[model samples]
Target: GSMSFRVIEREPRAQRVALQLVAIVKLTRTALLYSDPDLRRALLQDLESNEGVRVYPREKTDKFKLQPDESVNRLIEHDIRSRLGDDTVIAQSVNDIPGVWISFKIDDDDYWVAL
Candidate 1:
């Protein structure tokens, strides 16, 4: 004698998802980019949020039509050295694939360059 049983299949469960927007501040300055914490934090702060201007955090993850507003832009380019005591230079945001990318480089005389 033989016996048979019925089988059933169930659908897979959906995944719980969340998203966050953060500016990618890439440094091509030198190999030892992590040596200076101040410089790193300063740039990230600006990118995250500045005096009166907020981009990615305020709006959405859009870069093509975005520029660091007046105060933040100036702060990043000019006052960063005095504020942080580092010779890192912040260049203007350029058109990169995903979004605007901030370029920073350690000057020739910067201590980080030596390391």
Candidate 2:
């Protein structure tokens, strides 16, 4: 009994949840036409909070806004991975959806991104 004492090891149960805040910022036809920053941020907030949500009906012409590379870089500038490396962020706009989605993983359990 005098030789040793017990020590609890908690290395496996993560100190933080492994959830990542991925998002699809959508711009409605009116949202696109007006180009309101609040609406843009609101859509982004919804995406960040919502699940990998389903797509919309009127997205074909939200083409009213955004450029291919330009939108990607905006999200990149708003990403923590961009601060870590120039190539860490991934942009997707496949046949899956017209609105762009940016995704990345933060295994370090410590990171931040644009609001």
Candidate 3:
């Protein structure tokens, strides 16, 4: 028997995240119902079809290392430092959702695992 997990949203990032997860499962030698090549190809195709959507190569690394190209990092550190004068939004927001254990990240020279 098999089951399916539907992402809660239709956002392009969500689909990319799903495909990245698919790659991780493969790295762990888990049983996969579908080939990762197929999934990765699908994800690349998704990127092609969506013009405004851009994501960093974190989607590629199974090891969860933060790559320099991540939009969030670029937006926060260098870009934000320079572009604050041109911003339009009067108020900005951020949100976090709690979930099951998923991945790890490097923070301030320490390795932290979170989900």
Candidate 4:
């Protein structure tokens, strides 16, 4: 038996995954500032494909003039807090934006992602 190094098999880091989804929430927020057709389409699509947001409360009666501006229904915000595991403060403004910025935490430190 010849062993040159330790064989340590590991999956992706959970903390980094928190980092990943933090970015995901950031990107999701970016897409929500919509009216860019293509951007909105990808957001809706990825919600279904990757984020498991298939059952949309929009596209029903809400599909009015501007393709269901579900901001009132809290579609994005719901997903925001849902993935963050529990609600916290999401009320820090970002110079100028919709729905304010959001925050999430890992280990013992806090992280903020803008909307």
Candidate 5:
């Protein structure tokens, strides 16, 4: 049998985070799911569809890393670095319940591994 999970909200904020997560996941590869031609194609497609995300190839390596494009990255990093306090808002925002999350099962042990 298979288990399923569903989103808990339909708000635009929630939807935006979800799509960002999907874009990152397509580009990120764990030891278990190393890069390949098919995955690279899908990642490129997602990047093309989403304006908020972008990827650059790792020099002399068979890997790629995901991050916001120049415009978005500048603003986001500025906010994160310039903002005062414990950065708790940034932490709390996504850590809240029913937000974007990722998981996958690598074996039949039925344990859901958080990615």
Candidate 6:
């Protein structure tokens, strides 16, 4: 089995994660989000300690907790190709109450709506 993923932000009802944070320089500053010194130091420490954490080059990987765009599509395509090669038929991750349940075959195909 492969992993299924999608990010949800900039929706009518959805709450932007970073907006809830205490302090930030700018919202769409593409230079990476950890502007606060303490937070940067903490993230650096986590980066050093975490084994399962994949260190994706910002220029290469999709932005976390950002709006969907061509970059997001690229990331999804890369992930699918990595796991199932060209045989994979992937769907956008549903941004529902408990999140969309993903499987090799999902039955409710008719209900897909763009967020």
In candidate 6, what are the lDDT values of residues 1-115, reduced to their tens digit? 1233433332223123212210111221212343465675555445436522212222222222322457545554445334433533233333322211112212321111111
Off by over 4 Å in 1: 1-66, 83-92, 98-115
Distance from true location, Cα of 7 in model 5, Å: 22
Best by TM-score: 4
lDDT of 2 by residue, 1-115 (tens): 3344534442223121111322222222223335466675665456456644432323233223223567435554445242334533333442344444333332422111222
Lowest lDDT block of 10, candidate 2: 10-19
Please state the error at residue 50 of candidate 1 in Å: 25
Across 24-74, the per-residue lDDT of candidate 1 in tens digits comes to: 222223323554665665654453454321222211242333345685444
TM-score against native, each model: 0.21, 0.23, 0.18, 0.31, 0.22, 0.21
Candidate 1, backbone clash total? 0
RMSD of each: 18.6, 15.6, 18.1, 15.7, 15.9, 18.2
Using lDDT as the yardstick, the better of models 1 and 4 is 4
- Clashes in model 1: which pairs? none
lDDT of candidates 1 onward, in order:
0.32, 0.35, 0.30, 0.44, 0.34, 0.30
Candidate 5 vs. true structure, TM-score: 0.22
**What C-alpha lDDT, on a 0 to 100 scale, does residue 58 get in candidate 4?**
20
- Candidate 6, which ten residues in sequence have the lowest lDDT sum? 21-30
Error of 6 at 16 (Å): 19
Q: How does candidate 3 fare on TM-score? A: 0.18
What does the lDDT read for residue 2 in candidate 1? 25
Badly placed stretches (over 4 Å) of model 4 are 1-23, 26-73, 92-100
